[PDB]
């Protein structure tokens, strides 16, 4: 029961969500470079950088985003960056496992301890049990970005109006893709709550890295306010 307009919305969001890449050059490094804390962090830097470029490209195309106040635009972009990144990592993680073990080993050895890294992978497994389709990851990503709850937003109602149609769409998709589990939508929203705990967790990661003398490149410094 998607409306015509909902189906158009959905196609548009899908087109933008897969206008993506894991560039090949970063895959090549993952699967081929030398292995040390130093190289692994450089690879991780590149990965984070790609996620943020992807996020920017996705964000700017979201229907209505260009109509928003320009400072709110930045507040939404910075406010969503951590959540959106870990959601995209969860999607990827849950899609070969040799490739996966090698990447996971790099992430676990990129200059901070396992108490910082394990919680990411528990989250990937947690959301993985949900068996979400690509459309669900895309709409959730849009809903994360268009959150009216972020810090510093001047016109929260304008953002709420852009988020509401996506939530309606996601609710209908949950019934299309998982018709036998009527709590699926509620479970997705429970995982969003889980995702939000990464904001604090990410900040502790950055802090540990920086005590360890790691530096962040320009885009990461700006997006995460280092």
């Amino acid at each position: 029961e998607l409306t015509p307009d909902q189906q158009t919305l959905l196609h548009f969001i899908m087109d933008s969500y897969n206008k993506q890449r894991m560039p090949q050059e970063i895959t090549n490094k993952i699967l081929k470079e030398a292995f040390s804390a130093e190289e692994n962090f450089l690879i991780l830097t590149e990965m984070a950088t790609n996620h943020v470029q992807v996020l920017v490209e996705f964000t700017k195309k979201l229907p209505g985003f260009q109509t928003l106040d320009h400072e709110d635009q930045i507040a939404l972009l910075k406010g969503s960056a951590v959540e959106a990144m870990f959601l995209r990592s969860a999607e990827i993680f849950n899609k070969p496992s040799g490739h996966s073990d090698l990447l996971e080993a790099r992430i676990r050895n990129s200059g901070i301890s396992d108490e910082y890294i394990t919680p990411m992978f528990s989250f990937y497994k947690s959301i993985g049990e949900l068996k979400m389709t690509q459309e669900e990851y895309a709409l959730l990503t849009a809903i994360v970005i268009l959150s009216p709850d972020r810090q510093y937003i001047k016109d929260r109602e304008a953002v709420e109006k852009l988020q509401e149609p996506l939530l309606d769409v996601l609710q209908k998709l949950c019934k299309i893709h998982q018709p036998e589990n009527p709590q699926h939508f509620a479970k997705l929203l429970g995982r969003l709550t889980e995702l939000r705990t990464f904001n604090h967790h990410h900040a502790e990661m950055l802090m540990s890295w920086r005590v360890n003398d790691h530096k962040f490149t320009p885009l990461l410094q700006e997006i995460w306010d280092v």
Partner: peptide, 10 residues
């Protein structure tokens, strides 16, 4: 936020 504004505006 020059860098972010630059990327959002291109």
């Amino acid at each position: 936020n020059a860098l972010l504004r630059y990327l959002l505006d291109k």
